[PDB]
Amino acid sequence: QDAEWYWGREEVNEKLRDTDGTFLVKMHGDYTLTLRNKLIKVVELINHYRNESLAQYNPKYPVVGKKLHEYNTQFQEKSREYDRLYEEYTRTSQEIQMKRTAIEAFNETIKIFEEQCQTQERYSKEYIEKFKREGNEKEIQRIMHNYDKLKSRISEIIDSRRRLEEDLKKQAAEYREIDKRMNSIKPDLIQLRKTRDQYLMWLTQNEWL
C-alpha cells in the first residue's frame, strides 16, 4: 500500500506546484495519474511508464515539531520582509514617475518663462528706440527692473529642476537596490517554504503554526 507516489485534487495540484515529468497517483472512476497538469484515468501500470513515454498510448520523477514552529517563524518573517520590500519597490516606482512628470512640468514651465523674457525683449526694446528722450532713465530702469526679475526667477526654476533630477537618480539607485535584494531573498524564500512542507509532510504520516 505504501507505494511512494500513490497517496489515495487541491492538495494534488499544491504538491505538483513548481516541479516537468513529475507525477503522482466511485461511480465515475478509480485511480487517476496527475502527470505535470495532465490527469489520466495499480503498481503494475506505473513501473512500465516511468521507463517509457506516454506517446504510443495517446499521441501527444516519481516525487521535528518545534522545528515546524522555528522554520514557520523564518518563513513568516521572510514573507513580511518580502511584502515590505515590494511596497518600497512599488512606492518608489510611483514617487519616481511623479518626479519624471514634475520634471516635464518644470521644463514646460521654463519654456513659458524663456518665451517670456524673449517676448519682453521684443516689446521693451521696440519702446527703448521709439522716443528714447521721453522718460529716458525713468522708463528704461523700471522696464529693466521687471526684466532682472524674470531672468533671475528663471534661474531658480532651472535650479529647482536640477535639484529634482539629482534626486531622481538617487531614487533610481534605491529602486535598483530594492529589486536587487528582493531577487536574493526570493530563492531562499522558496527553499524555506519547500522544506517546511516536507517537514510538515513527514509528521502527517496549529499552535506551532
Binding site: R9, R17, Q76, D83, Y89, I112, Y123, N146, Y175, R193
Partner: protein, 1042 residues
C-alpha cells in the same frame, strides 16, 4: 532567567499631490506670477479660494501700474493658461474656477488671446478631468491600434446616441432614469402572503398652489397593476366631486391620465414603463420592510423640462501570404536583456525561460542555456519550438521570463501576442520591457499575466527577433477555415475501419452508445474546476457532434480541443459558429482567461446580447469590466457590447465609469480603460458634467484625508476635527462638496453639508463620516439626511466583491422562496485604496450593545445583554418578529460566511439593528488568505449571546424547537447555494484579472470547492456541513430533530 541573558545587539528602538506641486493645500493667501502679452511679470497677492474672474479683474487693474500698459487689450480679450501637475499647458476657459482647484504645479498664470477658434472643442478638458489624464496624452500615441480603436469605437457611440433620440423626450428620460426593476414579475410565495390577497396600500402625493402644500391619496390597488393604472386611480380620487357626474369624471381622468408619471418620494427614481408595481425594486422593498409606498404624481413637462439635449459631436479625428502556406516550425531569436538587478553573490546563473500559450501550453516548454550569468546578460540563440507554423491558433502568445539558479527562480516576465490586431503573424525585432513578479506567484513563467510590454522604461527590457517569411503572413479567413473543416470531416468518414487511440474519432458513427450519452451529461454538470482527464477530453472531442444536444457542455468541450491542431480547431470553429445559445450566467465562463479565442468569446457576447438583461448586466458588471483585461486587443466585441449598454442606460453607465476610473492607477489597464473612458465620456451626454462634480468631490476628500494622515497625525482628534471643520467651511469646499450625486447610488442627491454631523471616525486610517441634506421635495418621506463614509486607507475592492457575492446569495435564496434577509450595504472603490461605504443608521456593533449593557462595577459582560437590549427595542408582538428576523439574518450570514471563508468574526464586526437584523461588516480576506501560514474554518462562531436570542430566551438553547428551525434554515440555504456553485466559481474566476492578492490563480478559488463539498454527493455535503458546524461549536448539530 527570563531570556537566558541573550542580548539582541542588532535591536534599536530608534500619495498623489493636491493643490500645488509638493504641497497638499495651498496657503490661504498666496503670490502668483502673472505673465502678460507685453512681456511684463506682475506678482499678485491673492487668496487661495479666489476665482480667475477676480484674479483677472484685479490683474488688469494692477497691470496699469507697470510699464507698457497701452500694449494690453481689454481684459476680456484674454484667457489664463499655465502648466498643470499632469504637466500639460491647460487653457483656463471656465474662469469661475478657483485658484486652488486648478491643479497648478507652480503658482503662475500666463495671459493669452485664445488659440482655438473652437473653444467648444477644447472642452476635452472636461473629459480628461473625468478620466484623470489629459486627452492630448492619447493623440501623441504612435501605435496604430490605439488610434484605430479611437476612430472605430465612435461607430458604437453613434449607434447608442441614435437609440436615445428615438421617441424624444421619453427615451431621453428612459436613458437617464431607467426603471429600477427586479428580475422577474413573478412574486415569491412569502412576499405574496404579506398582501392580504394581492393588494398593497400605496400613497400617492400631489402638489397644488402655490406649490408649497402637498396632498396624500391613499390607494389600495393590486400588486401587479401598473404605473398608468395607479396614476388613474389617484386622479379619480383626486377629482371626484359632488359637482362632477360619473361620466364627467372619466372624461377629466382621460385628459389628465398621461400628463403625469410616478416618481418615488425622496429620491430620483421613476416608474416609466409597463411594469407590475411589485416588480419595481422600491415597491418590493416596501412589502418586505412592512412599509407603505410613497410615490409622487409628477407632471411629464416638469420632468422633461429638466432633461437637456445630449449635444454629441464627432471628434476632430473623424498582397499577403496565408499562415497555412508557411512550411516551417516556429523559432524565436532571444537577443539581450539590457538591465537586470541581481546580486552576483547570491545568484549563480540566469536564463530566459519561454513557451507558447493559449491560456494552457501547446508544446513542451523550453529555455535558452544558462549564459553570461548575472554580469551583463546576453544570449544570441534561436529558440526552436516543436509546433508547425500552420498549427498556431489565432489567440497564440509567447510567454517568457528571465530566471535564476534546483534553485529555479523568476526575475522579470512579459508576454507577446503572436498575432497583431490586424491578424498578422509577428515578424522582425521587438522591444519587450518586463513586469516584476507578484506576491503569490512563485511559478516561473506567468501566462495569466498581461499580454503586452510594461510602459515603464527603467525595467528589464528583453529584446528579441521573429522569423521572417519574405511577406506579411496573415491568419486565414473564415471561408478558408470552413472549407478545411468540411474536408477534414469528409476525410474522417472513410478512415481505416479500426483506429487505435480510439479516443481519436467515434467508431460508433450515427449510433453512439446509451451508456456513453449518460457519461456525457454527468461531465456537463461538473463545475469548471473539476479538472478533466485526457480520456474524458478525447472522449468529449470524439462525440463533439452529439455535444451540440447538450449546449452547456461547451466550456468542457472547448478545453478538450487540441489547439495545437488546426484540423481540430478549424472543425471546432464550425460547431461554435451556430452552437445553440446558452444562459448568460453560463456564457460568462467563456469570457474568463481559460477561453482566449475570438470566435468563442464572440459566441459568449452573442449570448449576452440576446439573454442578458440590464438588470443582470449591472449585477455582474464588475466581472465584465474585469474580464476585458483578458481580451487580446483593444477593440473587440465584448468592449463594443458594454460601451453600448453604458450609453443606453445611465445607471449602468455610472458604475461602468467608476469601475474603469477606479483602476486607472493600475498600468496593466490605464491605456485600455482610459481609452474606453474617453469614448464613454465623449458620448454619455450631460452626465459627464454630473460625473465631473462627483470626481471633483472625491479629489477634495482625498486631499483632505491625505493631510490628516500626514503632519496632522500626532494631534488630538480635537485638533484634527477643528482643522476638518475649518477646512470644510472654506468656499472651495462648500462649492465642491455640496451640490452633487452619491457615487454609491446617483439616484440620491447630496445637498448641503451639515458639518454638525460631519466628523472623523476613531480609526487610525482617518475615515470621514460625512452627512448631507436630502434636497428632494419629499425628503421627509424617505430620509431627510443622507450620510456615507469616505475611507482613504483600505483596499475596498475585496469587500466590494463579497458584498456582491452575498447580494447574489440573497437573490438565489429568496427567489427560490426561502427568506434569509442579508444586508449587503453599499460599497464602492473609486481609486487606489479609496472608497465609499453606505452607512446603516440604527445599527450597532455587538461590542457597543455590551458596553451599553455592562453593569456598574466592571466584573464581566452578560450574555443576555444582547437579548435584553433587543427586548428593550422590540416589545409586544413586535418582539416575536424581531427574533425571527435575527434568526433568518443569522442563518443566511452563517452560511454565506462559512462558504466564503471570510475573516474570523467577533464583537467589533457583527452588527445588530434596532429592528433585530444581524449583519456583518469588515470582511477582510475572503477565500481564506490567512491559511497560507485543510482548515475548512467556521468564521461565524455562534456564542451563547446569539443562541439565547435565537431560542426566545432560555437556558440550554441547543434543545429548543426555535433552534432546530434555525439549523434547518442553515441546511436548506447551504444546499441551495451548492446547486449554483458553478456561478460562484465563475464570479471568482472572472475576478482573477484585478490584482487582489486573494485571487491570484484558480486554486485560490478551489477553497470554495471543499467548503461547498462539490466532489461529494449532496447527502454527504449536508453531513460535511453539520460535521464542520458541530466541531466549531462543540455540540448541537449531528442530532436530527427530536
Amino acid at each position: 532567567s527570563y531570556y537566558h541573558h541573550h542580548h539582541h545587539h542588532d535591536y534599536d528602538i530608534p500619495p498623489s499631490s493636491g493643490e500645488l506641486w509638493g504641497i497638499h493645500l495651498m496657503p490661504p493667501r498666496i503670490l502668483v506670477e502673472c505673465l502678460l502679452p507685453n512681456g511684463m511679470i506682475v506678482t499678485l497677492e491673492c487668496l487661495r479660494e479666489a476665482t480667475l474672474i477676480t484674479i483677472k479683474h484685479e490683474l488688469f487693474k494692477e497691470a496699469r501700474k507697470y510699464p507698457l500698459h497701452q500694449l494690453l487689450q481689454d481684459e476680456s480679450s484674454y484667457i489664463f493658461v499655465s502648466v498643470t501637475q499632469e504637466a500639460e499647458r491647460e487653457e483656463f476657459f471656465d474662469e469661475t474656477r478657483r485658484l486652488c482647484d486648478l491643479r497648478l504645479f507652480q503658482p503662475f498664470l500666463k495671459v493669452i488671446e485664445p488659440v482655438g477658434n473652437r473653444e467648444e472643442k477644447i472642452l476635452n478638458r472636461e473629459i480628461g478631468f473625468a478620466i484623470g489624464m489629459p486627452v492630448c496624452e492619447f493623440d501623441m500615441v504612435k501605435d496604430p491600434e490605439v488610434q484605430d480603436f479611437r476612430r472605430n469605437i465612435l461607430n458604437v457611440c453613434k449607434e447608442a446616441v441614435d437609440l436615445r433620440d428615438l421617441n424624444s423626450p421619453h427615451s431621453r428620460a428612459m436613458y437617464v432614469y431607467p426603471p429600477n426593476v427586479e428580475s422577474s414579475p413573478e412574486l415569491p410565495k412569502h412576499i405574496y402572503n404579506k398582501l392580504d390577497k394581492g393588494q398593497i396600500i400605496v400613497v400617492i402625493w400631489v402638489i397644488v398652489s402655490p406649490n408649497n402644500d402637498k396632498q396624500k391619496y391613499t390607494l389600495k390597488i393590486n400588486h401587479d397593476c401598473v404605473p398608468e393604472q395607479v396614476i388613474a386611480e389617484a386622479i379619480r380620487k383626486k377629482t371626484r366631486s359632488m359637482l362632477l357626474s360619473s361620466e364627467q369624471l372619466k372624461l377629466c381622468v382621460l385628459e389628465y391620465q398621461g400628463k403625469y408619471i410616478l416618481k418615488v418620494c425622496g429620491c430620483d427614481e421613476y416608474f416609466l414603463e409597463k411594469y407590475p408595481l411589485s416588480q419595481y425594486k422600491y415597491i418590493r422593498s416596501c412589502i418586505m420592510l412592512g412599509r407603505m409606498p410613497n410615490l409622487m404624481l409628477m407632471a411629464k413637462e416638469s420632468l422633461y423640462s429638466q432633461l437637456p439635449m445630449d449635444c454629441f459631436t464627432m471628434p476632430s479625428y473623424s498582397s499577403t501570404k496565408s499562415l497555412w502556406v508557411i512550411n516551417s516550425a516556429l523559432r524565436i531569436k532571444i537577443l539581450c536583456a539590457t538591465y537586470v538587478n541581481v546580486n552576483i553573490r547570491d545568484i549563480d546563473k540566469i536564463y530566459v525561460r519561454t513557451g507558447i500559450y493559449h491560456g494552457g501550453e501547446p508544446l513542451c516548454d523550453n529555455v535558452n542555456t544558462q549564459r553570461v550569468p548575472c554580469s551583463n546578460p546576453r544570449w544570441n540563440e534561436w529558440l526552436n519550438y516543436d509546433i508547425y507554423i500552420p498549427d498556431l491558433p489565432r489567440a497564440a502568445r509567447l510567454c517568457l521570463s528571465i530566471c535564476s539558479v534546483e534553485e529555479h527562480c523568476p526575475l522579470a516576465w512579459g508576454n507577446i501576442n503572436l498575432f497583431d490586431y490586424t491578424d498578422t503573424l509577428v515578424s522582425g525585432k521587438m522591444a519587450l520591457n518586463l513586469w516584476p513578479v507578484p506576491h503569490g506567484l512563485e511559478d516561473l513563467l506567468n501566462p495569466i499575466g498581461v499580454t503586452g510590454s510594461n510602459p515603464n522604461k527603467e525595467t528589464p527590457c528583453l529584446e528579441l527577433e521573429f522569423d521572417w517569411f519574405s511577406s506579411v503572413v496573415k491568419f486565414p479567413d473564415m471561408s478558408v477555415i470552413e472549407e478545411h473543416a468540411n474536408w477534414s470531416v469528409s476525410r474522417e468518414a472513410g478512415f481505416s475501419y479500426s483506429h487505435a487511440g480510439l479516443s481519436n474519432r467515434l467508431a460508433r458513427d450515427n449510433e453512439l452508445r446509451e451508456n456513453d450519452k449518460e457519461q456525457l451529461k454527468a461531465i456537463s454538470t461538473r463545475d469548471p474546476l473539476s479538472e478533466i482527464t485526457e480520456q474524458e477530453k478525447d472522449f468529449l472531442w470524439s462525440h463533439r457532434h452529439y455535444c451540440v444536444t447538450i449546449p452547456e457542455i461547451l466550456p468542457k468541450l472547448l478545453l478538450s480541443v487540441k489547439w495545437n491542431s488546426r484540423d481540430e480547431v478549424a472543425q471546432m470553429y464550425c460547431l461554435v459558429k451556430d452552437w445553440p445559445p446558452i444562459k448568460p450566467e453560463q456564457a460568462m465562463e467563456l469570457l474568463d482567461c481559460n477561453y482566449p479565442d475570438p470566435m468563442v468569446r464572440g459566441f459568449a457576447v452573442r449570448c449576452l446580447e440576446k439573454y442578458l438583461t440590464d438588470d443582470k448586466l449591472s449585477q455582474y458588471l464588475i466581472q465584465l469590466v474585469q474580464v476585458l483585461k483578458y481580451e487580446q486587443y483593444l477593440d473587440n466585441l465584448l468592449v463594443r457590447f458594454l460601451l453600448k449598454k453604458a450609453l443606453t442606460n445611465q445607471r449602468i453607465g455610472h458604475f461602468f465609469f467608476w469601475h474603469l476610473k477606479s483602476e486607472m492607477h493600475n498600468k496593466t489597464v490605464s491605456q485600455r480603460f482610459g481609452l474606453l473612458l474617453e469614448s464613454y465620456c465623449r458620448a454619455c451626454g450631460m452626465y459627464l458634467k454630473h460625473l465631473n462634480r462627483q470626481v471633483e468631490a472625491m479629489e477634495k476628500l482625498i486631499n483632505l484625508t491625505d493631510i490628516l494622515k500626514q503632519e496632522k497625525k500626532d494631534e488630538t482628534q480635537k485638533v484634527q476635527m477643528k482643522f476638518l471643520v475649518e477646512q470644510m467651511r472654506r468656499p472651495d469646499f462648500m462649492d465642491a462638496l455640496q451640490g452633487f450625486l452619491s457615487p454609491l447610488n446617483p439616484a440620491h442627491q447630496l445637498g448641503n453639508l451639515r458639518l454638525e454631523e460631519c466628523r472623523i471616525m476613531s480609526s487610525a486610517k482617518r475615515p470621514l463620516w460625512l452627512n448631507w441634506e436630502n434636497p428632494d421635495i419629499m425628503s421627509e418621506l424617505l430620509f431627510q439626511n443622507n450620510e456615507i463614509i469616505f475611507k482613504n486607507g483600505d483596499d475596498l475592492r475585496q469587500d466590494m466583491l463579497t458584498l456582491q457575492i452575498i447580494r447574489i446569495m440573497e437573490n438565489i435564496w429568496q427567489n427560490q422562496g426561502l427568506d434569509l434577509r442579508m444586508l449587503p450595504y453599499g460599497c464602492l472603490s473609486i481609486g487606489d485604496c479609496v472608497g465609499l461605504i453606505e452607512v446603516v443608521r440604527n445599527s450597532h456593533t455587538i461590542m457597543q450593545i455590551q458596553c451599553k449593557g455592562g453593569l456598574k462595577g466592571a466584573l464581566q459582560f452578560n450574555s443576555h445583554t444582547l437579548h435584553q437590549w433587543l427586548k428593550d427595542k422590540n416589545k409586544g408582538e413586535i418582539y416575536d418578529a424581531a427574533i425571527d428576523l435575527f434568526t433568518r439574518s443569522c442563518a443566511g450570514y452563517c452560511v454565506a460566511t462559512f462558504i466564503l471563508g471570510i475573516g474570523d468574526r467577533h464583537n467589533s464586526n457583527i452588527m445588530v439593528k434596532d429592528d433585530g437584523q444581524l449583519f456583518h461588516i469588515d470582511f477582510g480576506h475572503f477565500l481564506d488568505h490567512k491559511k497560507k501560514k485543510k482548515r475548512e474554518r467556521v468564521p461565524f462562531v455562534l456564542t451563547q449571546d446569539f443562541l439565547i436570542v435565537i431560542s426566545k430566551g432560555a437556558q440550554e438553547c441547543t434543545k429548543t424547537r426555535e433552534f432546530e428551525r434555525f439549523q434547518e434554515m442553515c441546511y436548506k440555504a447551504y444546499l441551495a447555494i451548492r446547486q449554483h456553485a458553478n456561478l460562484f466559481i465563475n464570479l471568482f474566476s472572472m475576478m482573477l484579472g484585478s490584482g487582489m492578492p486573494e485571487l491570484q490563480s484558480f486554486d485560490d478559488i478551489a477553497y470554495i470547492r471543499k467548503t461547498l463539498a462539490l466532489d461529494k454527493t449532496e447527502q454527504e455535503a449536508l453531513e460535511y456541513f453539520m460535521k464542520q458546524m458541530n466541531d466549531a461549536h462543540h455540540g448541537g448539530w449531528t442530532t436530527k430533530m427530536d
